[PDB]
Amino acid sequence: DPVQKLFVDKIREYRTKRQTSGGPVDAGPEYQQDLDRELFKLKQMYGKADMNTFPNFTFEDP
Amino acid sequence: IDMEKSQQALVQKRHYLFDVQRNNIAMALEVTYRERLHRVYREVKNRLDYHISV
């Protein structure tokens, strides 16, 4: 199973990725701008509510 | 005489109008109830879902 060089190569490279992931590695500002735009469209589709605010409607009657 | 008898029977059956009015009021409130339930449940569903999205 280890004889195939490519499998072990990918394995070790991903291992290195995991250790370097102590923090996420190689974001790059492009990453941040993409996050910005996609989160913006997501929230705009959803709304302007808080991250985790449990709201209420304050009902009424006819 | 016959007209008097007939309108007397009409008077007897009178109550239907008021009863319809009460029926209207009652189940109006009831389905207001049920839609408020739907509203809260759906809202919390949406609020929790925009986190799975992220």
Nearest by CB to residue B53, choosing from A42, A56, A61, is A42
Taking contacts as CB-CB distances below 8 angstroms, the residues of chain A near B46 are: 46
Neighbours of A12 (CB within 10 A): 10
Q: Does B37 touch chain A (CB under 8 A)?
A: no
Report yes or no: B32 and A59 within 8 Å, Cβ to Cβ: no
HEC string of chain B?
A: CHHHHHHHHHHHHCCHHHHHHHHHHHHHHHHHHHHHHHHHHHHHHHHHHHHHHC
SS3 A43: helix
CA B33 – CA B35 distance, rounded (Å): 6
Give the resolution to one decimal, in Å.
3.3
Spell out which residues of chain A touch residue B53, defining contact as CB-CB under 8 Å: 42, 46
**Domain range summary for chain A, segments of one domain joined by +:** 1-47
What are the chain A neighbours of B26 within 8 Å (beta carbons)?
none
Burial string for B2-26 (b: 16+ CB within 10 Å, else e) reads: eeeeeeeeeeeeeeeeeeeeeeeee
